[PDB]
Amino acid sequence: DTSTWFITITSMIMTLFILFQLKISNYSYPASPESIELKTQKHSTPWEMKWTKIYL
């Protein structure tokens, strides 16, 4: 109850923070998916500008 002596649990808590940093590290953010559509637009526009400079 008023328990005692403490040599227990606290060494078994930091092994747990090797688990939770393994699972939650492999998550996906919805926002990152909206960023890859932006750089694809500017690249072909500059490639068309490279084709416009191939005209001009």
Added chain:
Amino acid sequence: IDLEKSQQALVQKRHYLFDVQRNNIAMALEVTYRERLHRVYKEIKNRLDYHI
């Protein structure tokens, strides 16, 4: 599509205007030869008009 026609647009443009430069200078020698045959009649018409 728009950059495929951008190839073909400059190859019908260039061959038209590079023959306009052929014929814009071609008229420059006819009108200076036609006025060469005409002027040599004009200064011999002055002597055909003076002595009368």
